[PDB]
């Protein structure tokens, strides 16, 4: 009822420093909303649930998006605008600590276990389908949708990667590192809001309500 081929077809269907990252984050939010619709059964949900789901997990659906596409970049991150942000440019802007964490707990691990877009796709779907979000109308359907995702992810791993039995767990164990990064990434974005030094485009302002 929740196939990985349809989920992978969603990931492929969507393709100085701080200011560039806030522009990239804005444009990437428009792309996240279209990634979510192509995820099975997401649009069958109440529109007020769809809002709660994306709005509760964008800070780390985006981080996962940029982390995996940065596997090729060494000691840096490839942004959605095609612009590279280098670790040296990161510390220079005063945001070196969290940048290092994304390079170590995220990009580096997706590299060493050679994470593919299907595993990333299911990991992101698991993030999208989080029944712990506050205000949902029917958390059970969201939980049962999440259960359908990782039940399908465990099978994809067992059939494609039989030489790595614990491959399923290594993927799930990257989700706690993500919740951590995404929260610290809001605590920064929110501060960039107060001072007003960084231009923050329309869509990103709304998420930073």
């Amino acid at each position: 009822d929740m196939p990985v081929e349809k989920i992978l077809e969603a990931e492929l269907a969507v393709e100085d420093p701080v200011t560039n990252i806030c522009q990239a984050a804005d444009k990437q939010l428009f792309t996240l909303v279209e990634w979510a619709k192509r995820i099975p059964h997401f649009s069958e949900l109440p529109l007020d649930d769809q809002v709660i789901l994306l709005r509760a997990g964008w800070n780390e659906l985006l981080a996962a998006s940029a982390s995996h596409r940065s596997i090729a970049v060494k000691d840096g991150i490839l942004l959605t605008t095609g612009l590279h942000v280098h670790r040296n440019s990161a510390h220079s802007a005063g945001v070196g600590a969290i940048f290092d964490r994304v390079l170590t707990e995220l990009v580096s691990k997706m590299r060493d276990m050679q994470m593919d877009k299907t595993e990333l796709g299911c990991l992101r779907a698991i993030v999208l389908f989080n029944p712990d979000s506050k205000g949902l109308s029917n958390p059970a359907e969201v939980e049962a949708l999440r259960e359908k995702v990782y039940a399908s992810l465990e099978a994809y791993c067992k059939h494609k990667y039989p030489e790595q039995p614990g491959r399923f767990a290594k993927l799930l164990l990257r989700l706690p590192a993500l919740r951590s990064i995404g929260l610290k990434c809001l605590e920064h974005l929110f501060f960039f809001k107060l001072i007003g030094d960084t231009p923050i485009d329309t869509f990103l302002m709304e998420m930073l309500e």
Binding site: V33, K37, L47, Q50, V51, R55, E206
Partner: peptide
């Protein structure tokens, strides 16, 4: 309350 998100979800 979430203008750009409600608009982006319907189309």
């Amino acid at each position: 309350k979430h203008k750009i998100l409600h608009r982006l979800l319907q189309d």
